[PDB]
């Protein structure tokens, strides 16, 4: 999701 920030999928 480019609309969030987080970890790898």
């Amino acid at each position, epitope marked *: 999701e480019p609309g969030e*920030r987080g970890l790898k*999928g």
Partner: antibody
Amino acid sequence: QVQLEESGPGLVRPSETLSLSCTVSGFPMSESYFWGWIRQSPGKGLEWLGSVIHTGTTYYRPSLESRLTIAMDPSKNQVSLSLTSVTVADSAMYYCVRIRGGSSNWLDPWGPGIVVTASS
Amino acid sequence: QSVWTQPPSVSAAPGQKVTISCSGDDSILRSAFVSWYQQVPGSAPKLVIFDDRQRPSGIPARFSGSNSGTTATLDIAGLQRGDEADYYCAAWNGRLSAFVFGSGTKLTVLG
């Protein structure tokens, strides 16, 4: 070319609020990129403060979240930072950055930076 | 951790190869894409590696990166004078739910 410029006070009194803003040129903030703030205290390392995207989604440094507000005005090509009750430990170079989010989380480009000194 | 662990100093002669390493608790780095930043005195950080091993336009292929998961690395070969700088790794930390930087490494190109 994509260019970021920081502005705000160079000298603030402790207990006052630090208000910074950043002007983006040659790139719209309506693209799917975050806009954020990093600081670097003299002779020391880098410290991510937080970031925001045009949808309204915001992330903060957990140590500073209660004192931090980071917001975006896409019409004015502006991202901003407000940090309440400034401490002497908040003296640093402050950089504005474009962030590709998702799982990438890379920072490019970086403003040249603005020196903020906190002293009574 | 709040800050990734890098060695403070690494050095080597011009023409040689150096590895700057970056690590967190256990194998935390495996879950994230690491980026690396070059900072010369007087300037802001410049991106030199992103998504573990990708080079942005302008970065030469003698710079390379990897993320084994325990330890991420920035490897710079054929050292030149202009590679002497501070290098910072960076990655998202989902346990803290924050974007974390490393403690920095000065790469001295020996003169």
